[PDB]
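Hi L.,

As promised, DRP3:
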Amino acid sequence: GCPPCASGCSPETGEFCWREDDCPPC
């Protein structure tokens, strides 16, 4: 499943691209 406020992205560098539905909104 997708990780919260990550969804495959590279968080902690200005990336908050979260996934909808299966993932909680960031």
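Residues 1-26 form one domain.

Thanks again for sending the construct details.

K.
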